[PDB]
Protein backbone atom coordinates (compact mmCIF):
# COMPACT_ATOMS: atom_id res chain seq x y z
CA UNK A 1 0.00 0.00 0.00
CA UNK A 2 2.44 2.61 1.24
CA UNK A 3 4.58 2.51 -1.89
CA UNK A 4 1.56 2.98 -4.15
CA UNK A 5 0.55 5.85 -1.90
CA UNK A 6 4.04 7.35 -2.24
CA UNK A 7 3.87 6.97 -6.03
CA UNK A 8 0.53 8.78 -6.20
CA UNK A 9 1.88 11.47 -3.90
CA UNK A 10 5.00 12.01 -5.99
CA UNK A 11 2.97 12.29 -9.17
CA UNK A 12 0.62 14.85 -7.68
CA UNK A 13 3.54 16.77 -6.20
CA UNK A 14 5.24 16.92 -9.59
CA UNK A 15 2.45 18.98 -11.24
CA UNK A 16 1.34 21.24 -8.40
CA UNK A 17 4.08 21.80 -5.80
CA UNK A 18 7.41 21.50 -7.62
CA UNK A 19 7.79 25.15 -8.68
CA UNK A 20 7.98 26.62 -5.17
CA UNK A 21 9.37 23.71 -3.13
CA UNK A 22 11.75 22.09 -5.62
CA UNK A 23 11.99 18.59 -7.03
CA UNK A 24 13.80 17.34 -3.90
CA UNK A 25 11.57 19.33 -1.53
CA UNK A 26 14.50 21.65 -0.75
CA UNK A 27 12.68 24.95 -1.28
CA UNK A 28 13.10 27.68 -3.87
CA UNK A 29 14.69 30.85 -2.55
CA UNK A 30 11.84 33.39 -2.56
CA UNK A 31 9.00 31.12 -3.70
CA UNK A 32 8.62 28.64 -0.86
CA UNK A 33 10.45 27.01 2.05
CA UNK A 34 11.96 23.57 2.43
CA UNK A 35 9.49 20.78 3.18
CA UNK A 36 12.19 18.45 4.53
CA UNK A 37 10.97 17.45 7.96
CA UNK A 38 7.51 19.00 8.07
CA UNK A 39 5.64 15.69 8.45
CA UNK A 40 2.26 14.41 7.40
CA UNK A 41 0.55 16.88 9.72
CA UNK A 42 1.86 19.91 7.88
CA UNK A 43 0.77 18.57 4.50
CA UNK A 44 -2.62 17.58 5.86
CA UNK A 45 -3.28 20.99 7.42
CA UNK A 46 -2.06 22.95 4.42
CA UNK A 47 -3.57 20.95 1.56
CA UNK A 48 -6.80 19.85 3.21
CA UNK A 49 -7.69 23.28 4.53
CA UNK A 50 -6.96 24.64 1.04
CA UNK A 51 -3.99 26.84 1.89
CA UNK A 52 -1.72 25.09 -0.65
CA UNK A 53 -1.00 25.79 -3.49
CA UNK A 54 -0.30 29.44 -2.79
CA UNK A 55 -0.79 31.34 -6.02
CA UNK A 56 0.54 34.78 -5.10
CA UNK A 57 2.92 35.98 -2.41
CA UNK A 58 1.38 38.50 -0.01
CA UNK A 59 1.32 39.12 3.72
CA UNK A 60 -0.59 35.90 4.38
CA UNK A 61 -1.93 32.89 2.55
CA UNK A 62 -5.64 32.47 3.18
CA UNK A 63 -7.94 29.52 3.66
CA UNK A 64 -9.76 28.77 0.42
CA UNK A 65 -11.51 25.92 -1.34
CA UNK A 66 -9.39 22.74 -1.36
CA UNK A 67 -7.68 21.65 -4.55
CA UNK A 68 -7.18 17.98 -3.59
CA UNK A 69 -9.33 15.24 -2.14
CA UNK A 70 -8.58 13.96 1.35
CA UNK A 71 -7.22 10.74 -0.16
CA UNK A 72 -5.00 12.76 -2.49
CA UNK A 73 -3.92 14.86 0.48
CA UNK A 74 -2.84 11.73 2.33
CA UNK A 75 -0.98 10.47 -0.73
CA UNK A 76 1.01 13.71 -0.90
CA UNK A 77 1.56 13.60 2.86
CA UNK A 78 3.01 10.10 2.59
CA UNK A 79 5.40 11.21 -0.14
CA UNK A 80 6.52 14.30 1.78
CA UNK A 81 6.92 12.32 5.00
CA UNK A 82 9.40 10.05 3.24
CA UNK A 83 11.77 13.06 2.89
CA UNK A 84 12.66 13.23 6.57
CA UNK A 85 9.63 12.53 8.72
CA UNK A 86 8.17 15.04 11.14
CA UNK A 87 4.98 15.10 13.20
CA UNK A 88 2.18 12.86 11.99
CA UNK A 89 -1.59 12.52 12.07
CA UNK A 90 -3.72 11.64 15.08
CA UNK A 91 -5.37 8.27 14.47
CA UNK A 92 -7.98 6.76 16.76
CA UNK A 93 -7.88 3.32 18.38
CA UNK A 94 -9.40 1.50 15.40
CA UNK A 95 -7.13 3.21 12.83
CA UNK A 96 -9.43 5.80 11.27
CA UNK A 97 -8.23 9.39 11.21
CA UNK A 98 -9.47 10.90 14.46
CA UNK A 99 -12.25 13.49 14.33
CA UNK A 100 -15.09 13.90 16.83
CA UNK A 101 -13.24 11.72 19.35
CA UNK A 102 -10.82 14.63 19.90
CA UNK A 103 -13.64 16.72 21.47
CA UNK A 104 -12.11 16.63 24.93
CA UNK A 105 -9.99 14.10 26.77
CA UNK A 106 -13.04 12.50 28.44
CA UNK A 107 -15.18 12.39 25.30
CA UNK A 108 -17.94 9.81 25.20
CA UNK A 109 -20.83 10.81 22.97
CA UNK A 110 -21.03 14.41 24.21
CA UNK A 111 -18.69 17.14 25.41
CA UNK A 112 -18.14 17.18 29.17
CA UNK A 113 -18.16 20.55 30.91
CA UNK A 114 -14.98 20.02 32.95
CA UNK A 115 -13.08 19.70 29.68
CA UNK A 116 -14.65 22.93 28.48
CA UNK A 117 -13.74 24.64 31.75
CA UNK A 118 -10.06 23.67 31.54
CA UNK A 119 -9.85 24.23 27.78
CA UNK A 120 -11.33 27.68 28.25
CA UNK A 121 -8.45 28.70 30.48
CA UNK A 122 -5.93 27.02 28.19
CA UNK A 123 -7.39 28.81 25.18
CA UNK A 124 -7.61 32.14 26.99
CA UNK A 125 -3.90 31.88 27.89
CA UNK A 126 -2.32 30.36 24.76
CA UNK A 127 -4.69 31.22 21.90
CA UNK A 128 -7.19 34.03 22.54
CA UNK A 129 -4.50 36.73 22.32
CA UNK A 130 -4.55 36.24 18.54
CA UNK A 131 -7.94 34.59 17.89
CA UNK A 132 -10.07 36.62 20.37
CA UNK A 133 -12.22 35.10 23.15
CA UNK A 134 -14.14 32.25 21.52
CA UNK A 135 -12.05 32.37 18.38
CA UNK A 136 -13.64 35.00 16.14
CA UNK A 137 -10.30 36.25 14.79
CA UNK A 138 -7.84 39.06 15.17
CA UNK A 139 -5.55 41.36 13.24
CA UNK A 140 -1.77 41.07 13.35
CA UNK A 141 0.97 43.26 11.95
CA UNK A 142 1.09 44.42 8.32
CA UNK A 143 -1.92 42.76 6.74
CA UNK A 144 -1.65 39.49 8.69
CA UNK A 145 -4.46 38.09 10.79
CA UNK A 146 -5.52 35.17 12.92
CA UNK A 147 -8.43 33.44 11.13
CA UNK A 148 -11.90 32.58 12.36
CA UNK A 149 -11.87 29.17 14.03
CA UNK A 150 -15.22 28.05 12.59
CA UNK A 151 -14.12 26.37 9.37
CA UNK A 152 -11.52 24.08 10.98
CA UNK A 153 -12.31 20.47 11.85
CA UNK A 154 -10.80 18.74 14.87
CA UNK A 155 -7.90 17.16 12.98
CA UNK A 156 -7.07 20.58 11.54
CA UNK A 157 -7.13 22.18 14.99
CA UNK A 158 -4.69 19.55 16.24
CA UNK A 159 -2.34 19.86 13.29
CA UNK A 160 -2.43 23.65 13.46
CA UNK A 161 -1.31 23.39 17.06
CA UNK A 162 1.47 20.98 16.10
CA UNK A 163 2.81 22.58 12.92
CA UNK A 164 2.68 26.32 13.60
CA UNK A 165 1.35 27.56 10.26
CA UNK A 166 2.78 30.84 8.94
CA UNK A 167 3.09 33.32 11.86
CA UNK A 168 1.41 30.94 14.34
CA UNK A 169 3.69 29.58 17.09
CA UNK A 170 4.32 25.88 17.49
CA UNK A 171 2.82 23.98 20.41
CA UNK A 172 4.52 20.59 20.60
CA UNK A 173 3.03 17.72 22.57
CA UNK A 174 5.64 18.41 25.25
CA UNK A 175 4.42 22.00 25.59
CA UNK A 176 0.67 21.29 25.50
CA UNK A 177 0.10 17.61 26.16
CA UNK A 178 -2.42 15.58 24.20
CA UNK A 179 -5.16 16.06 26.78
CA UNK A 180 -4.69 19.82 26.92
CA UNK A 181 -4.98 20.00 23.13
CA UNK A 182 -8.11 17.86 23.21
CA UNK A 183 -9.63 20.13 25.84
CA UNK A 184 -8.83 23.17 23.68
CA UNK A 185 -10.67 21.39 20.87
CA UNK A 186 -13.60 20.74 23.20
CA UNK A 187 -13.75 24.43 24.11
CA UNK A 188 -13.57 25.62 20.50
CA UNK A 189 -16.37 23.29 19.48
CA UNK A 190 -18.54 24.07 22.51
CA UNK A 191 -18.42 27.81 21.94
CA UNK A 192 -18.60 27.46 18.15
CA UNK A 193 -21.84 25.44 18.41
CA UNK A 194 -23.81 26.81 21.41
CA UNK A 195 -26.30 29.61 20.60
CA UNK A 196 -26.08 32.60 22.89
CA UNK A 197 -28.91 32.55 25.46
CA UNK A 198 -29.42 36.31 25.18
CA UNK A 199 -30.50 36.38 21.56
CA UNK A 200 -28.51 37.33 18.49
CA UNK A 201 -24.78 37.35 19.11
CA UNK A 202 -23.93 40.19 16.68
CA UNK A 203 -20.86 38.23 15.61
CA UNK A 204 -19.52 37.95 19.18
CA UNK A 205 -16.91 40.58 18.30
CA UNK A 206 -17.31 42.61 21.47
CA UNK A 207 -18.38 46.18 22.21
CA UNK A 208 -17.75 47.61 18.71
CA UNK A 209 -20.55 45.44 17.32
CA UNK A 210 -23.16 46.49 19.87
CA UNK A 211 -21.92 50.04 19.51
CA UNK A 212 -22.48 50.17 15.74
CA UNK A 213 -25.85 48.43 16.20
CA UNK A 214 -27.17 50.94 18.74
CA UNK A 215 -25.35 54.13 17.78
CA UNK A 216 -26.59 53.81 14.20
CA UNK A 217 -29.78 51.82 13.85
CA UNK A 218 -31.05 51.88 17.42
CA UNK A 219 -31.06 55.67 17.66
CA UNK A 220 -32.29 55.83 14.07
CA UNK A 221 -35.53 53.97 14.79
CA UNK A 222 -36.27 56.15 17.82
CA UNK A 223 -35.56 59.25 15.75
CA UNK A 224 -38.11 57.83 13.32
CA UNK A 225 -40.54 57.44 16.22
CA UNK A 226 -39.90 61.04 17.24
CA UNK A 227 -40.61 62.18 13.69
CA UNK A 228 -43.81 60.16 13.73
CA UNK A 229 -45.00 61.78 16.94
CA UNK A 230 -43.67 65.31 16.37
CA UNK A 231 -43.86 67.98 13.70
CA UNK A 232 -41.51 68.63 10.79
CA UNK A 233 -42.68 72.25 10.72
Amino acid sequence: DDQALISEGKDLYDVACITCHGVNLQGVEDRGPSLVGVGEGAVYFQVHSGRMPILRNEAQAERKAPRYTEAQTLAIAAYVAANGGGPGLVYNEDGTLAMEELRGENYDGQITSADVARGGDLFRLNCASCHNFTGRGGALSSGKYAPNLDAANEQEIYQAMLTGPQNMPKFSDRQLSADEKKDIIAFIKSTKETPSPGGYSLGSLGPVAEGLFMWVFGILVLVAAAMWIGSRS
Binding site: R118, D121, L125, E180
Partner: protein, 51 residues
Protein backbone atom coordinates in the same frame (compact mmCIF):
# COMPACT_ATOMS: atom_id res chain seq x y z
CA UNK B 1 6.35 49.40 41.64
CA UNK B 2 9.99 48.38 41.77
CA UNK B 3 9.36 44.73 42.60
CA UNK B 4 7.65 41.61 41.34
CA UNK B 5 7.84 37.95 42.28
CA UNK B 6 11.18 37.67 40.50
CA UNK B 7 12.73 39.97 43.11
CA UNK B 8 12.78 36.89 45.34
CA UNK B 9 15.81 35.72 43.35
CA UNK B 10 17.82 38.50 44.99
CA UNK B 11 16.89 36.98 48.39
CA UNK B 12 18.70 33.75 47.38
CA UNK B 13 15.50 31.82 46.66
CA UNK B 14 15.44 29.35 43.80
CA UNK B 15 12.63 30.52 41.51
CA UNK B 16 11.74 28.16 38.70
CA UNK B 17 9.99 29.31 35.56
CA UNK B 18 6.57 27.73 36.08
CA UNK B 19 4.23 27.01 33.19
CA UNK B 20 0.48 27.24 33.68
CA UNK B 21 -1.60 24.06 33.50
CA UNK B 22 -5.07 25.65 33.90
CA UNK B 23 -6.05 22.80 36.22
CA UNK B 24 -9.44 23.31 37.84
CA UNK B 25 -10.76 22.12 41.19
CA UNK B 26 -12.19 18.60 41.41
CA UNK B 27 -15.61 17.78 42.86
CA UNK B 28 -15.69 14.87 45.31
CA UNK B 29 -19.09 13.78 46.61
CA UNK B 30 -20.09 11.14 49.15
CA UNK B 31 -22.65 10.26 51.84
CA UNK B 32 -22.09 13.56 53.70
CA UNK B 33 -22.06 16.08 50.83
CA UNK B 34 -20.16 17.41 47.84
CA UNK B 35 -17.11 19.64 47.89
CA UNK B 36 -14.65 21.17 45.48
CA UNK B 37 -11.03 20.46 46.30
CA UNK B 38 -7.60 21.47 45.03
CA UNK B 39 -5.49 19.42 47.44
CA UNK B 40 -3.54 17.41 44.87
CA UNK B 41 -3.94 20.02 42.14
CA UNK B 42 -1.20 22.35 40.93
CA UNK B 43 -1.73 25.46 38.81
CA UNK B 44 2.00 25.72 37.96
CA UNK B 45 4.61 23.13 37.04
CA UNK B 46 8.31 23.31 36.36
CA UNK B 47 9.43 22.91 32.76
CA UNK B 48 12.53 21.82 30.89
CA UNK B 49 14.38 23.10 27.79
CA UNK B 50 13.25 20.13 25.68
CA UNK B 51 9.58 21.12 25.85
Amino acid sequence: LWTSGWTLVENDVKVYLGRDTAAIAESHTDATGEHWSTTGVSRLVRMRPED
